[PDB]
Amino acid sequence: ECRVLSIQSHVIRGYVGNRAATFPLQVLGFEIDAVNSVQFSNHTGYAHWKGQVLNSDELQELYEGLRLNNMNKYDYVLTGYTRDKSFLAMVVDIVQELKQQNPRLVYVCDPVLGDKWDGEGSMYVPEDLLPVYKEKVVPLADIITPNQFEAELLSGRKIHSQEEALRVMDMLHSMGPDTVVITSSDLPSPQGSNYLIVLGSQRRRNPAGSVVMERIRMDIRKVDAVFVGTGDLFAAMLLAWTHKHPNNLKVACEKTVSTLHHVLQRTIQCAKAQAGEGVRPSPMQLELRMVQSKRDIEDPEIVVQATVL
Amino acid sequence: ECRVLSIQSHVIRGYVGNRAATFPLQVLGFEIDAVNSVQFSNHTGYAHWKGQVLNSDELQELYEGLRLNNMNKYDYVLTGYTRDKSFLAMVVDIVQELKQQNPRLVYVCDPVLGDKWDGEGSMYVPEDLLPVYKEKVVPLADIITPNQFEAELLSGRKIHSQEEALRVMDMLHSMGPDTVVITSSDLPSPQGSNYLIVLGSQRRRNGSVVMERIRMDIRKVDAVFVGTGDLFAAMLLAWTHKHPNNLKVACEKTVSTLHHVLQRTIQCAKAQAGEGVRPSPMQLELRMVQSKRDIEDPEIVVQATVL
Ligand SMILES: OC[C@H]1O[C@H](O[C@H]2O[C@H](CO)[C@@H](O)[C@H](O)[C@H]2O)[C@H](O)[C@@H](O)[C@@H]1O
Ligand SMILES: OC[C@H]1O[C@H](O[C@H]2O[C@H](CO)[C@@H](O)[C@H](O)[C@H]2O)[C@H](O)[C@@H](O)[C@@H]1O
Ligand SMILES: O=c1cc(-c2ccc(O)c(O)c2)oc2cc(O)cc(O)c12
Ligand SMILES: O=c1cc(-c2ccc(O)c(O)c2)oc2cc(O)cc(O)c12
Ligand code: NA
Ligand code: NA
């Protein structure tokens, strides 16, 4: 009944891209269709990796197979890490088509560009993707989940405070999407030093017809490791819970963040047991414990409340 | 914990191959790794389909990545439909090496060759695949799920009766596999014309060699479903894993799971198509996602009899 077209990476071993997004959305009842934009043995954080990349002509072929069977009717599109400009442009063309087929289609975009490590911001994708994201992808997106670095790149503005972040989210709203969620490890938290800040803003038209905006903030005590695939799972769960709670960004974000916390907590406890006391766990040991978190995906216990902005 | 390497087709829309096998095994708690041997828009029962095939060099490249990371430690391998002889030969090489890494690895093989339509056999794969299955795949496999037609092709004999099928299953056992399930047949059922027979045979140690043989008579729901054999092999893997000494219960849970999925699928297909209208392939896609709770704990709706 609720159809999602997810165009993301596939790995054999582990949970990133479509492997992070598909099982949880299926567990939540979505008819999610996975276009695998790469097929790799494992993610590129390992010592070794091999695989094959889907090119934009092949992506167009697969969409053509859907169109010919009148199977190009989706409720959502979901994208994330995209490596190639020609590929991103074909994704744009497909989303435009799908939005003409279904004007109510919701495009959820994780605009993966890069991140910051201890002051150095640096990108993960070719720099020539940024104009495509600015002029073609973000204007088409309805929900975007930039981290702070990508929100800065997309807006052209450095963020030094919650104030400036909220201004950047307004800037992002004006570029296209009605829902903007920024994640940041660099904004300060009154709760401590290992906290992640989530800022969410959603504009909607209420039953009376007025355009209003709900703004929220979460201060999350991180679990004591860094993982691969976290942003992919975040965007997938944000899709799921905004779908279930379309007019309640606070609840949507609380369920999203609580799902991630349960998965990551379980993952770090399993990784440390495999690694041993004091031993730094490997990337293999840090793979998200996705199938073991089924019950937390289905009904996450809320472990952090958002504050109203 | 329990890791499965599944080398099968991927489709964007629908449930065949790895799309039929992965979600249910994930729901049941297996760490299933999906090697997509093709990526097509949909299965070939539709009017159109587009996509790309994984070749044997690309399969080897993928496995090398796993091996370089010391990630080639699996508890199960699972395969089904393969069109390409060199690809199937690569799979055998990989399974051989995974068995060297883990001697207790269980290879579950659906030896997809063809099927009978009105008693008439017709084939799904090129002829040169049959020698590969007979001489390389089946000898390596530990659990196989041929239909009757495939059992006849692999063994070289016709099956006209239960007794003949069980003798053919014994020949398959002697070729390698300790578990053989003939998943559909033309055999008659006392329950009526609208039933098919499923027969299972498992060789195991109690520490003597003992045999368990079972039979089930299953009311065949009337529709052409795709991916049924893929789901059957995946759930046989799952339930023989949970019940290693009880083929009867493993088969009851497998068939019951299929029943719940297919029953839900035909109820939905008939509602979308309307009274009288034969449903389309798109309306008949397995309602996999909506069957999550039946997969988790299938209500037993069929009893197997121990032979
Ligand atoms: O829409 C189909 C089913 O969706 C719901 O159930 C799923 O989503 C829930 C959260 O919204 C999960 O808790 C649950 O585990 C999923 O199965 C709905 O509750 C079901 O009745 C529908 O069948
Ligand atoms: O081994 C991991 C889990 O496996 C079981 O749970 C799964 O399998 C059950 C059937 O064997 C399903 O009923 C259940 O929904 C699955 O989650 C086992 O019962 C659990 O304890 C394990 O965590
Ligand atoms: O909810 C959480 C959301 C995120 C997150 C979200 C988006 C990203 O692009 C990212 O890199 C991390 O990270 C977490 C890290 C945590 O340790 C705990 C958490 O709850 C979260
Ligand atoms: O358990 C069932 C198993 C299957 C089946 C299994 C393997 C195949 O290669 C195949 O072509 C069909 O077929 C069924 C058809 C049914 O209508 C109901 C069922 O329960 C089954
Ligand atoms: Na993100
Ligand atoms: Na079969």
Side-chain angles (χ1 to χ4, degrees):
Chain A
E1 265 266 90
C2 187
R3 301 197 173 274
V4 180
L5 181 70
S6 184
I7 311 170
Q8 301 187 64
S9 292
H10 181 69
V11 289
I12 304 314
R13 172 63 62 96
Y15 299 94
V16 304
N18 266 337
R19 281 282 285 188
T22 293
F23 175 70
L25 285 172
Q26 292 178 314
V27 158
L28 290 172
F30 293 86
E31 278 300 333
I32 166 159
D33 292 353
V35 180
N36 298 323
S37 57
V38 315
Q39 174 158 228
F40 276 35
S41 68
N42 48 266
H43 66 67
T44 58
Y46 283 93
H48 316 271
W49 45 268
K50 307 215 208 202
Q52 302 89 25
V53 166
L54 193 75
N55 68 52
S56 59
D57 281 284
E58 308 177 302
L59 170 59
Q60 178 173 202
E61 220 206 320
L62 292 158
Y63 171 78
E64 181 73 16
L66 296 178
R67 193 169 47 200
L68 295 166
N69 291 303
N70 189 42
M71 283 159 5
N72 58 347
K73 288 134 181 62
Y74 282 93
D75 303 295
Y76 288 81
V77 177
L78 177 63
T79 69
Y81 165 78
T82 310
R83 49 154 254 150
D84 177 69
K85 175 165 134 141
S86 136
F87 195 95
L88 190 54
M90 178 76 56
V91 166
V92 168
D93 292 341
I94 291 161
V95 172
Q96 292 178 180
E97 286 274 326
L98 293 173
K99 280 204 164 187
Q100 294 174 234
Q101 299 308 309
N102 173 19
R104 284 201 308 130
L105 183 140
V106 176
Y107 176 22
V108 181
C109 171
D110 184 2
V112 175
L113 296 160
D115 215 334
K116 316 142 100 83
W117 306 259
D118 213 21
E120 292 141 352
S122 91
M123 293 184 50
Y124 300 148
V125 298
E127 291 180 356
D128 69 5
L129 296 197
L130 181 60
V132 182
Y133 270 112
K134 281 190 200 173
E135 311 155 12
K136 301 228 262 146
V137 179
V138 173
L140 213 50
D142 310 282
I143 309 184
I144 63 168
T145 61
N147 61 31
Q148 181 182 332
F149 174 85
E150 327 158 320
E152 289 170 346
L153 277 186
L154 289 169
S155 66
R157 287 215 198 172
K158 183 102 199 43
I159 288 159
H160 307 96
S161 67
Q162 175 184 290
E163 177 186 320
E164 286 167 353
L166 290 178
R167 207 252 172 301
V168 166
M169 314 174 48
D170 287 351
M171 289 188 69
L172 294 172
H173 283 307
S174 87
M175 281 173 67
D178 290 334
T179 302
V180 174
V181 176
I182 296 184
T183 50
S184 161
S185 299
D186 284 309
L187 292 171
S189 163
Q191 297 237 282
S193 42
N194 224 38
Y195 273 76
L196 180 77
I197 308 310
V198 178
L199 299 176
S201 172
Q202 180 172 84
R203 313 180 37 98
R204 37 189 205 252
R205 193 180 302 276
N206 68 10
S210 308
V211 174
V212 302
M213 183 176 58
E214 184 184 356
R215 273 175 166 170
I216 61 99
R217 174 176 166 138
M218 312 194 54
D219 288 70
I220 307 145
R221 194 241 307 121
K222 298 148 91 164
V223 313
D224 214 82
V226 175
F227 308 85
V228 181
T230 306
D232 307 318
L233 180 54
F234 185 74
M237 293 311 317
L238 184 64
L239 184 163
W241 292 121
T242 58
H243 178 75
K244 324 278 208 173
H245 304 280
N247 298 304
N248 196 332
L249 184 68
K250 180 175 186 299
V251 169
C253 289
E254 281 167 356
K255 284 179 161 174
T256 298
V257 164
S258 291
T259 301
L260 272 279
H261 200 271
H262 295 307
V263 172
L264 269 46
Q265 191 53 234
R266 178 169 291 99
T267 301
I268 195 46
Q269 309 166 343
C270 296
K272 292 211 261 225
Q274 306 189 330
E277 292 80 332
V279 186
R280 172 177 190 250
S282 67
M284 197 199 72
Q285 291 163 328
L286 284 175
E287 286 292 356
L288 303 184
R289 298 297 191 281
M290 276 329 285
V291 320
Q292 303 86 355
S293 296
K294 175 181 55 175
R295 293 317 188 213
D296 295 322
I297 294 160
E298 288 174 333
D299 190 14
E301 209 140 305
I302 305 309
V303 300
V304 46
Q305 297 219 306
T307 52
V308 170
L309 294 188
Chain B
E1 267 306 8
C2 193
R3 302 188 170 281
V4 176
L5 184 68
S6 173
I7 306 163
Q8 301 189 246
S9 290
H10 183 65
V11 293
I12 294 173
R13 168 74 53 100
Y15 299 92
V16 298
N18 266 337
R19 282 282 288 194
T22 294
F23 173 71
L25 284 172
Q26 291 177 314
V27 162
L28 290 178
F30 295 86
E31 277 309 331
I32 169 166
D33 294 349
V35 182
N36 299 322
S37 61
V38 310
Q39 171 159 237
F40 286 18
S41 54
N42 48 264
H43 67 64
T44 58
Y46 290 84
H48 324 267
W49 68 85
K50 296 311 180 180
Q52 314 77 39
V53 170
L54 189 76
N55 70 50
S56 57
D57 293 310
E58 304 177 311
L59 177 62
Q60 170 165 33
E61 191 173 23
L62 290 171
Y63 172 75
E64 193 70 12
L66 299 174
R67 174 193 89 71
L68 283 166
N69 287 308
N70 295 334
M71 292 171 344
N72 60 340
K73 282 118 172 73
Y74 282 91
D75 301 289
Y76 291 83
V77 174
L78 176 65
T79 67
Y81 174 81
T82 321
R83 193 202 55 211
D84 190 81
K85 180 222 185 119
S86 45
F87 196 93
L88 190 57
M90 200 33 95
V91 167
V92 166
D93 287 332
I94 285 157
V95 176
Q96 261 159 198
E97 197 169 89
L98 293 180
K99 282 193 175 194
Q100 309 183 3
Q101 291 288 353
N102 176 17
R104 291 163 107 62
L105 185 150
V106 170
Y107 174 25
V108 181
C109 169
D110 184 9
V112 178
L113 302 161
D115 209 339
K116 275 158 154 3
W117 311 71
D118 321 298
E120 181 236 11
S122 150
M123 288 235 303
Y124 293 158
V125 306
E127 319 224 335
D128 43 290
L129 273 191
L130 187 46
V132 182
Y133 272 108
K134 283 201 237 178
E135 305 165 40
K136 288 165 135 187
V137 185
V138 176
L140 227 47
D142 306 289
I143 306 182
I144 59 159
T145 62
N147 59 32
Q148 175 180 336
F149 174 73
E150 287 155 358
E152 295 172 342
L153 282 187
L154 292 169
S155 70
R157 312 193 173 181
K158 302 238 199 203
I159 291 164
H160 312 95
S161 76
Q162 185 172 285
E163 296 91 341
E164 256 163 39
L166 292 177
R167 277 190 298 272
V168 155
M169 294 170 72
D170 286 338
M171 305 157 63
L172 296 173
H173 275 140
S174 85
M175 303 184 25
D178 281 1
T179 301
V180 179
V181 174
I182 294 183
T183 77
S184 52
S185 69
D186 282 343
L187 299 172
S189 166
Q191 288 270 246
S193 55
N194 50 315
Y195 283 82
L196 91 180
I197 310 310
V198 161
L199 295 167
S201 181
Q202 183 166 84
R203 172 179 55 199
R204 71 169 165 270
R205 265 197 210 283
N206 58 11
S208 1
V209 56
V210 302
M211 291 283 279
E212 187 180 3
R213 298 189 179 84
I214 65 106
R215 180 175 129 100
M216 318 169 51
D217 299 53
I218 311 156
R219 199 249 281 150
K220 48 210 199 214
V221 312
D222 191 21
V224 33
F225 299 109
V226 198
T228 298
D230 306 323
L231 181 60
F232 184 88
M235 311 276 94
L236 188 69
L237 189 164
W239 293 116
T240 60
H241 184 72
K242 327 266 193 171
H243 305 281
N245 305 312
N246 199 332
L247 183 72
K248 177 183 181 292
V249 162
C251 287
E252 284 163 351
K253 292 184 163 186
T254 300
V255 168
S256 292
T257 296
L258 265 292
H259 187 260
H260 296 300
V261 173
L262 294 180
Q263 198 66 287
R264 177 171 289 102
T265 299
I266 187 94
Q267 309 306 42
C268 291
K270 295 213 289 213
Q272 299 180 267
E275 319 65 65
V277 192
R278 172 154 119 150
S280 75
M282 161 194 337
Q283 298 168 330
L284 288 176
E285 291 283 358
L286 301 177
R287 297 304 191 280
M288 287 303 314
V289 153
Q290 303 78 5
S291 299
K292 171 180 63 175
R293 300 198 303 161
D294 298 313
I295 294 158
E296 282 176 326
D297 203 303
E299 188 162 26
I300 308 297
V301 300
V302 60
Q303 217 86 69
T305 64
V306 176
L307 300 185

Short mmCIF file of all heavy atoms in Angstrom, two decimals, chain A residues 45-64:
data_model
loop_
_atom_site.label_atom_id
_atom_site.label_comp_id
_atom_site.label_asym_id
_atom_site.label_seq_id
_atom_site.Cartn_x
_atom_site.Cartn_y
_atom_site.Cartn_z
N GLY A 45 34.90 1.39 4.70
CA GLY A 45 35.64 1.54 5.94
C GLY A 45 36.51 0.36 6.32
O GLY A 45 37.33 0.46 7.24
N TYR A 46 36.34 -0.77 5.64
CA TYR A 46 37.15 -1.95 5.89
C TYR A 46 38.51 -1.79 5.23
O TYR A 46 38.68 -1.03 4.28
CB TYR A 46 36.46 -3.16 5.29
CG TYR A 46 35.30 -3.66 6.12
CD1 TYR A 46 34.01 -3.21 5.86
CD2 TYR A 46 35.47 -4.67 7.06
CE1 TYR A 46 32.92 -3.66 6.59
CE2 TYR A 46 34.39 -5.15 7.79
CZ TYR A 46 33.11 -4.65 7.54
OH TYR A 46 32.04 -5.13 8.26
N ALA A 47 39.48 -2.57 5.72
CA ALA A 47 40.78 -2.64 5.06
C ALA A 47 40.65 -2.94 3.57
O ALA A 47 41.35 -2.33 2.76
CB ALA A 47 41.65 -3.70 5.75
N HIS A 48 39.75 -3.85 3.19
CA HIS A 48 39.57 -4.21 1.79
C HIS A 48 38.10 -4.09 1.38
O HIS A 48 37.20 -4.18 2.22
CB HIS A 48 40.03 -5.65 1.50
CG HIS A 48 41.34 -5.99 2.15
ND1 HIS A 48 42.55 -5.76 1.53
CD2 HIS A 48 41.63 -6.48 3.37
CE1 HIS A 48 43.53 -6.13 2.33
NE2 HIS A 48 43.00 -6.57 3.46
N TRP A 49 37.88 -3.92 0.08
CA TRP A 49 36.56 -3.91 -0.52
C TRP A 49 36.70 -4.03 -2.03
O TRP A 49 37.67 -3.54 -2.61
CB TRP A 49 35.78 -2.62 -0.14
CG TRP A 49 36.59 -1.35 -0.26
CD1 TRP A 49 37.33 -0.75 0.73
CD2 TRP A 49 36.73 -0.52 -1.42
NE1 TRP A 49 37.91 0.40 0.25
CE2 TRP A 49 37.56 0.56 -1.06
CE3 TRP A 49 36.23 -0.59 -2.72
CZ2 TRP A 49 37.91 1.56 -1.97
CZ3 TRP A 49 36.58 0.41 -3.62
CH2 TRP A 49 37.41 1.46 -3.24
N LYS A 50 35.74 -4.72 -2.64
CA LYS A 50 35.61 -4.84 -4.09
C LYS A 50 34.14 -4.82 -4.46
O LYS A 50 33.28 -5.19 -3.66
CB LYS A 50 36.24 -6.14 -4.62
CG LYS A 50 37.68 -6.39 -4.19
CD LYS A 50 38.42 -7.07 -5.34
CE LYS A 50 39.58 -7.93 -4.85
NZ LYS A 50 40.61 -8.15 -5.92
N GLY A 51 33.85 -4.39 -5.68
CA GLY A 51 32.48 -4.45 -6.15
C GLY A 51 32.30 -3.74 -7.47
O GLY A 51 33.27 -3.32 -8.11
N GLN A 52 31.05 -3.61 -7.86
CA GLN A 52 30.65 -3.04 -9.14
C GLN A 52 29.69 -1.88 -8.92
O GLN A 52 28.91 -1.86 -7.97
CB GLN A 52 30.00 -4.12 -10.03
CG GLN A 52 30.94 -5.31 -10.28
CD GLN A 52 30.81 -6.41 -9.22
OE1 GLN A 52 29.77 -6.54 -8.57
NE2 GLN A 52 31.89 -7.16 -9.02
N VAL A 53 29.74 -0.91 -9.83
CA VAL A 53 28.94 0.30 -9.72
C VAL A 53 27.86 0.26 -10.79
O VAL A 53 28.11 -0.21 -11.90
CB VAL A 53 29.86 1.54 -9.86
CG1 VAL A 53 29.06 2.79 -10.10
CG2 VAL A 53 30.76 1.67 -8.64
N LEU A 54 26.64 0.69 -10.44
CA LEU A 54 25.60 0.90 -11.44
C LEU A 54 25.83 2.25 -12.11
O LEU A 54 26.08 3.26 -11.43
CB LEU A 54 24.21 0.86 -10.79
CG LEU A 54 22.96 0.75 -11.67
CD1 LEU A 54 22.77 -0.68 -12.23
CD2 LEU A 54 21.70 1.17 -10.92
N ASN A 55 25.76 2.30 -13.44
CA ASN A 55 25.91 3.58 -14.12
C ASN A 55 24.53 4.12 -14.51
O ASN A 55 23.52 3.42 -14.43
CB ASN A 55 26.86 3.49 -15.32
CG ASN A 55 26.32 2.65 -16.47
OD1 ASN A 55 25.20 2.85 -16.94
ND2 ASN A 55 27.14 1.72 -16.94
N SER A 56 24.51 5.40 -14.91
CA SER A 56 23.23 6.09 -15.12
C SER A 56 22.43 5.50 -16.26
O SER A 56 21.19 5.57 -16.26
CB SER A 56 23.47 7.58 -15.37
OG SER A 56 24.28 7.78 -16.51
N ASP A 57 23.10 4.93 -17.27
CA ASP A 57 22.37 4.29 -18.37
C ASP A 57 21.64 3.05 -17.88
O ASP A 57 20.50 2.79 -18.28
CB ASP A 57 23.34 3.93 -19.49
CG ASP A 57 23.70 5.13 -20.34
OD1 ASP A 57 22.85 5.55 -21.17
OD2 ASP A 57 24.82 5.66 -20.16
N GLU A 58 22.30 2.27 -17.01
CA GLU A 58 21.67 1.09 -16.42
C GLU A 58 20.53 1.48 -15.48
O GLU A 58 19.50 0.80 -15.44
CB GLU A 58 22.73 0.28 -15.68
CG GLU A 58 23.96 -0.03 -16.55
CD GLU A 58 25.06 -0.78 -15.82
OE1 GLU A 58 25.56 -0.28 -14.79
OE2 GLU A 58 25.45 -1.86 -16.31
N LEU A 59 20.71 2.56 -14.71
CA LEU A 59 19.62 3.06 -13.88
C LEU A 59 18.41 3.42 -14.73
O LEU A 59 17.28 3.07 -14.40
CB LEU A 59 20.09 4.27 -13.07
CG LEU A 59 18.98 5.03 -12.34
CD1 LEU A 59 18.25 4.10 -11.36
CD2 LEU A 59 19.57 6.24 -11.61
N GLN A 60 18.64 4.10 -15.86
CA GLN A 60 17.56 4.47 -16.76
C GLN A 60 16.87 3.24 -17.34
O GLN A 60 15.64 3.22 -17.49
CB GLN A 60 18.11 5.37 -17.87
CG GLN A 60 17.10 5.79 -18.89
CD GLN A 60 17.67 6.82 -19.86
OE1 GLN A 60 16.92 7.56 -20.49
NE2 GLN A 60 18.99 6.86 -19.99
N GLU A 61 17.65 2.22 -17.70
CA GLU A 61 17.09 0.95 -18.18
C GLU A 61 16.15 0.33 -17.16
O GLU A 61 15.05 -0.13 -17.51
CB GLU A 61 18.23 -0.03 -18.49
CG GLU A 61 18.05 -0.88 -19.74
CD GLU A 61 18.82 -2.20 -19.66
OE1 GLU A 61 19.97 -2.21 -19.16
OE2 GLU A 61 18.27 -3.24 -20.11
N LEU A 62 16.58 0.24 -15.90
CA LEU A 62 15.74 -0.38 -14.89
C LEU A 62 14.46 0.40 -14.68
O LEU A 62 13.37 -0.18 -14.58
CB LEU A 62 16.52 -0.51 -13.57
CG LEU A 62 17.69 -1.49 -13.57
CD1 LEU A 62 18.67 -1.12 -12.46
CD2 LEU A 62 17.21 -2.94 -13.42
N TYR A 63 14.55 1.74 -14.64
CA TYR A 63 13.34 2.53 -14.53
C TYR A 63 12.45 2.31 -15.75
O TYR A 63 11.22 2.25 -15.63
CB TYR A 63 13.67 4.02 -14.37
CG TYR A 63 12.44 4.88 -14.48
CD1 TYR A 63 11.56 4.99 -13.41
CD2 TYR A 63 12.13 5.55 -15.65
CE1 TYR A 63 10.41 5.76 -13.50
CE2 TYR A 63 10.99 6.31 -15.76
CZ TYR A 63 10.13 6.42 -14.68
OH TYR A 63 8.99 7.18 -14.78
N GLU A 64 13.05 2.16 -16.93
CA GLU A 64 12.24 1.91 -18.12
C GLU A 64 11.46 0.60 -17.99
O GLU A 64 10.31 0.52 -18.43
CB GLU A 64 13.13 1.88 -19.36
CG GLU A 64 12.33 1.65 -20.62
CD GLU A 64 11.51 2.87 -21.02
OE1 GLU A 64 11.81 3.98 -20.51
OE2 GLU A 64 10.57 2.73 -21.84
#
